[model samples]
Target: QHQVKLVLKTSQDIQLFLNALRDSRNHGISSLSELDLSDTRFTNQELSDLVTALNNIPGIKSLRLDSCGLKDSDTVELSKLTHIKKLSLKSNYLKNRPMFNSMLEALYLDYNTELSASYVLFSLSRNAAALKKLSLRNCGVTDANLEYLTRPESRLKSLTHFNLRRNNITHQGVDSFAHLQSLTTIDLSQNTGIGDEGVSRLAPLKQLRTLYLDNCGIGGEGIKAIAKMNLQTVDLSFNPGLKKEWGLDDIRPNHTIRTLLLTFCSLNDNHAKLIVSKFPAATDLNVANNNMTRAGVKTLLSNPIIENLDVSTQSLYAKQQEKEKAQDLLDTICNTITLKSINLEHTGITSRMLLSLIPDETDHKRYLKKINGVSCKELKPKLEQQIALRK
Candidate 1:
């Protein structure tokens, strides 16, 4: 009987069972907030109970019901969970129709391949205001869909993270995301038609943080455009035609890039070295498993910001900081002002590690607030300050 009894193995399973343990004390404790039943099959009643519990859970934060075989009817139950902040329904079969958009601050519906345009528009209309992160990857969405999705009211005004990876969107559709005022991270990797022109349009998102363009149609022009934007991370791996001098042709080196991934791209030694020298803040660099050699790797490591190195290139740099420990090498690298790609990656830095090194607080007086180098962030702050001074 003990062997035959059911034991929940995953978080999603527990979520499905959270409300269906038959006895209230069986699930252990009270007041549920976060729940994930992704890939865990459940009946409609079972899901409804979970949603009900989620609604009442005090200060619940995140919920994920992705790939739970969610049907259209299940949405009614799911819609009741509006009190929570983040929600995900990826791979669910729910065709979120005219209603059911309330109750989430951030939502991910990626891989809901069955979702229709009507449902998508409906959700946008209902939940665009509070949403911070949204994912529609592999939802069968195309450029035409952006027409409604990018409308003033439908546009995700409060959005910070957007995932459009592996979609069929093209350059024509890229302009749709321009007006979104609060975007930070955008993932459009593996979408073939989103070429240089498409990325050029999105380059204006001044507040952008992370950009994933792997396996896409991005080339030299796209890289150059993005390099101009002071971003924290840029993933351009697997883009075949990204030229060797992706960032150099410009007069000034990129000043704000940190995490750069160039695996499976066409970057050579010179190109790698150039980036690290240009972007002084760069930390995470992945040029591994490419055509680079020992000398190329060594030359690249001359920079200091890199800490997590995945350089498949031949040899480490013997000349600079070669025999030093990690901290000593990092200190030596940080001492220098200019940076390049090889110098950045030679330190073997990853994005997470690099972020840890950031100063605890920015100097309030000297903070540069430019958005996409177009003077957006600075404009508002400066205007406000000027008004205050006048008063």
Candidate 2:
């Protein structure tokens, strides 16, 4: 039987589509395994009938009901699709618990903030589960309830990618992750309670390739392990951690991390320089919103392989306002062998200085490819307008 993915937005033709499913099946035609009904408001019975109609045909493997104004009962209708492998019920108004299909490989239930942790986790931790990617960001999940899926014999053991950002989870909750050794990428950002010791526990997870600990109250002691974890991308922004020490002694001689994000991590010239020395292989760095001036960034841009750098200025402190140092930064950007893109938004640099800073002639030698959010929002257009004059 031939299959087609049915994509219908809005309430229009749902009845017509339902008739087509019946009509197509009668004529020996089979529609899609994928169904996307995003933003389409449906009556409870209408949704139920839709589910039933699809079930009459066969198991629809993928169903996306994002922002669909679904209620608790509406979520239950989804659980009836026992053979479903990928499901997204994100941004729905789900308060009561949801019964998940056992065969789900990827589940996106983020922003259903009112759903209690126990019931949701209970359904997720149901027997015979085979989930891979589970995202529960900004949901009302707490540490105690999170233990359901983190147990030693947890059904979610196969999950490789997990997102638990902005939850009420602490180190106690994170400790459960040790049981899930297969995880490669995890986001524990904005869980301010999970500090140094919590993050340090993840050092033994050798399979971890990327970790996000932004705004997590983590300290330098935590990142010391991150430096050696062979993580390709680690975001430690908005935390007072990494403020005191580089802790180089804790890492191996040739530690490698490709992308290091340290925005608002309170780095000075010395700190930035130390990091630059430690992570020589890091081509992408987001060291923005710092208390440092171009003097700090000067050392940062010294790395020959550095490609992308987010060096935006702080809102309160206009560090990029210094004309001489600003020109110095531009000079470094012009000279850096691999510098591709740099963020200069909110730098408070004037267009006049930018005009003076850039060379009179359009020099093709500068490897710099793009300058983003240049100067302030007001001057961004003006700077580009003047830069166009050079050609």
Candidate 3:
């Protein structure tokens, strides 16, 4: 009738802990639904014992074995767990092929250096209908490996999220994703082989809602392809290769893309004006670590619908830190009719400038929702006092 979570550690032989769980299970404590063994060291026998104990709990549905030194043999034990629907084996040393039993719905295999595309494809091909989400970030996946899904029989029609960030996949691999008709989110960030052509390949994935293409060798040529999809959130940050003329005009009519993250994309005053005029529908805009100045921020504030705006910095090339300019930006934001949240952390905005945004007791309304100013040491005490007064 109730749910329980069991977190085991390396301090004891994990088998002994599993044995205690088994004893408890025998006494009607059968509601253990989630198990986490992350950052623990256990032998093959101990892992087998843990899996055996897990099988005893009919309600067990989620299991995490991240960084647990899992081998291919241990993966075999997991395949026998038919009741487990959500499974994570991230940062393990698995190399051999795995056979997932029925009912697997979500799987994470990130940072598994030895995990190959062939084994992953084969395993998912068996459970194509059952899987709904899969993450294979930094798992040595290449275009050659992704070709396995091009076959009609191996298609995963039920998957909605497929994360391939930091992989070696190219345009050839990109086309294979068109087969995943149910996909609503995909991350191909940091993939060097995915260029303008690869962006075009994603046009067929009409159901996609969230896309991450940061540092993926994309340019303006890819913008038109991305505009065609029904995306709600898009990250095109850190694409220095993109030209100044990169056509964002194509996305002007997309009312669905409410969030646009464009950190360090070489955006200037001209680009900022273009974005404010074209993407007014985007309520959440992140242009942090770019070439934007006071003029640019003013252009952004011209949009009446922006609720969350981030212009912070981790930029190696430029820092938009003029104290007077920052004050003007904050003041203009307070005057705006719809602005709610803002991030001015590490942007040279002083505490006096920040506190000025808060209304006096005479004012009956508050305009700001959240302000993230990690570097504003002087602003902390005043902000805390104001929060206490509000409560």
Candidate 4:
């Protein structure tokens, strides 16, 4: 006999999806690898049914539902999905943070609009041992907060990814992260208060891989200091010293570095051209939206690395190759949507995209209809369609 594996998504139509699940009971699905329902509309009763469905299923590995209009009550009920490994809760309008004291590989909370940085950071310490990746960009978290939050030494042992972009954290606050030995990737871009001192403080993390420092007040000296090491990827965009201030001569295009993203880092045509020439090993580079004219990028076009670049649609500079990298980065942080991240303006996505990301209920037919109060014909068809595809 073969195993029954399924993917569950919940867009805008929850009841219809749930009803469709009511009728398809015979197939017997036992495992789910991915389930994404971050943005959708569902009431309390509907949530209960969904939770029951997810709980009954035995093998759900990854689950993401950021800003799907879930309340604290919803998370309180998610105690059943304890078996899940990778969980994302990026800005889901949750009033309270979820409790995760068990085993989890990666947990995202970067853009929780409602939950303050302190709330998420505090909760992380509670379950830090299990966390591998964590994001808090634009979540209003400060360095002082991380100081206390990361103090439980053993708790942060397994953390690898940490995101704190676009906040007010300064060098003093960032000092808290100095001891996080397990951290590999860190996003500290757009944190205006972080300067050379802040970048200097991160030198202790020898295992660091990707680091984002856009608009973080890093000068030539700071950039040079970080470039001295062997890194996998780095983003130095929007800093003030790429050309006239410090010149690209100081920026090391190290062989160990694979990707380097520098958008609008005060570089003119000449400096931009030189930096690309110096770094032959930087296979993935982002130099779009800078002061470079066509001539500046033309020089880079000849480099073999430039042949396969993923320029941003916003900058019109990267090639299609860079799309996957950019999207992966976007998806990485986008996972931070949860009840703690929910806010009024930052919905974490567009209305249409939100509609398409929900799970179909046929995956949970018996479980979907058992709880109560979910009904919609179109929703049912969608669920039926999902079930039919599986059969």
Candidate 5:
């Protein structure tokens, strides 16, 4: 009746493992916890007897048989195990209809290269009520397959998480997601064709809290559409070629988008300021790959809202054509705008410039309970020694 996980790869084959299971039954062991039986094929008779045996042990809650070469009919025996909710028989099988039971909660059909998305989604319509999460990542789901969700009775209305990442879907088919109105989180990242036009179709999902569209070729219009909703966290990074020139100054304040990530979206100081002010509720902001000047970043730190920020890997000093002593401008900005800060990892400033940013004893500053001085070559070993020796 306690927990037991038996992975049967090292023990010869399936029949030999079954013998061990029968042996365990004699040791006064009737119910086990998890059964790990992956990477094998089960025929109709063997599969039936195996599931029946496991069913006899009512406490066996977790049963894993991923990559078992399971075909459509093979799952019929497996479906009787109601304690096992997530079914991973999502590989390429016959273009067929072999139903799963109603207690199924999650299905991971990701990476099914030959299984087209249409057949699976169509099958899901029959058991959609109990489905909570469905991931069809890289399953060759084309825009056409998405049309299956549009059928009224075929929708997975209870699904809270839907992942179609790295698929063949584009804007033309995204309107089908309107049927997935209960989704709280959806990841369509790496599907490059899902541009701004496709993103607009998801505006009706009022219950959505987190969205992942990074590297999806989304433009400002796509973001604007999402901004209109009450999203909590959004990541639209790595689309440096996004359509430029928009009015963010007048963007009505949005308190809901608190964890925003726009790395490498071709940002400048003005855009950063506008976003910082507009999404003032943001506590975790990462706009790194941007050409944000140190002066511009001060405006970010001045807000005192963000707890985790990444402005790294940019020419933070590229705009400062200032020669030697002109490190004064960086220092001047630092001293005046100084508060508490973290992570100056690659700013190329020396110990002196770092010192210039520190406040007088009266101002009170407790710096990084840690500091990342990596690549800040100007702070040589001796100064590192000096800081280490300070107290």
Candidate 6:
């Protein structure tokens, strides 16, 4: 059944929708499991009337109240809707703990600065039994608040996906995360206080497959711990302290990983060579905004299995870092591995240079199909000529 979204401006509009649902049995509103009232303003009487209408529909499994100006009293009425399994209250004004039912499996309370860890703990105490995904991104959550989950009696065993992005969590807080044994995906990105120790503490989560630690104050010690995990995707980009030589030997045996992001990690030729050799099975690789010159590109394009490569520039000065080697790099790549495409957004490559490298017609098109990042006005004609020849 299709979800119902109404811009409830007045009590009359809400009543009209409710009345329509009651009259039209075959209108599919009876089987509605999802309801979105985001960005809608409502008075207390209208909210009470809305709650009454929602109470009639016990099959509502997903509810969104984003920017709806939710208050404590509104949440109290919402708590009675026990069948709601997915709830999102993004950018709401909720401050106090509003009792939630235990049936919820996914809850998103993002950008609610008024809500504290105590509120989260109170909600978890009642609903953690079935909670599988919880996103409290930018909710002012701290390490002390996360400690409640680590308590021996904590019932959040079903929780697997957790997003703690842009919070005050540190290495100590990450230590408490070791208790979540069922976690498969975790985003600690942009938490600058978390260092290598914090990352190493996550080694116990054997079920973890995807981890994001971008811009966290991590170094080689953290990479060493991450190298040992049976992960499929890891984003350690923007951590400048992480050099290429941290755990190259340990990473060679991790065969399951397919995507590795090391953008702006101070990578060079040696790092690129090591990555190409170690992650032979990797399909997606991003090493953009680094100090990699043509030497690194030579080493990276040698791999035969890589499908997507991003050597795009993040800074104006980065054009100098990988200067003038676009033709040579493309030639080497076209002769070597079968890449799906390569991104050269701001690296030094002109339409003239590109035309010289690409062939008129050959099997190279099967491996290297597209050349991305060429948007100069003067290069359009040259690019079109080369493209027509290839076709």
Question: Which candidate ranks first by TM-score, i.e. highest?
Answer: 3
Worst-scoring 10-residue span by lDDT in model 5: 367-376
2 or 5: which has the higher TM-score?
Answer: 2
What is each predicted model's overall lDDT from 0 to 1?
0.65, 0.74, 0.76, 0.61, 0.68, 0.76
Candidate 2 lDDT tens digits, 257-350: 8888898888777887777777887778888888777777778888878888887784312442455666676667667767767776677755
Question: Which residue runs does candidate 3 get wrong by more than 4 Å?
Answer: 1-7, 10-13, 23-32, 248-252, 314-327, 362-366, 373-391
Instruction: Quote the positional error of residue 203 for candidate 2 in Å.
Output: 1.9
Residue-wise C-alpha lDDT for candidate 3, range 1-391, written one tens digit per residue:
3444445666475666776768763534446577777878777777777777777776778888889888887887788785788999899888867556557889899999988777777667756678898999999898877776777677466889999999898898988777677889999999978988998888888788999999988887876566556789999888866536767654555667899988888777787776776666778999888887767777888888888888876321122455556666667877766777778766665555666665554554445656774323445566668756776
Per-residue error (Å), model 2, residue 167: 1.2
Error in Å for residue 117 of model 1? 4.5
Candidate 5 residue runs with Cα over 4 Å from true position? 1-8, 11-50, 53-73, 89-99, 317-391
List runs of model 2 lying over 4 Å from the truth.
1-13, 16-34, 52-61, 150-152, 253-255, 314-324, 352-366, 373-391
Rank list by lDDT = 3, 6, 2, 5, 1, 4
lDDT-wise, the better of 1 and 5 is 5
| Tens digits of per-residue lDDT for model 4, 1-391 | 2232233344445765656544446225555366776666567777677666655554556777776666666666654565667777777766455565457777776576676566657766765677787777677787767765556543667778888887788988777887887789999998978888888888888899888988888886676667666678888888866645444464656677777877667566676555565566665566655565434544454454332342322232243555544344333223322211111112222322222323344433111121011233344455556666766
**How displaced is residue 72 in candidate 1, in Å?**
1.8
Looking at model 6, report the run of 10 residues with the lowest lDDT sum. Answer: 314-323
Itemize residue pairs with steric clashes in candidate 5: none
lDDT of 5 by residue, 246-333 (tens): 4555578788988888888888887777676777777667777777776667667665555555666665543235544337445534
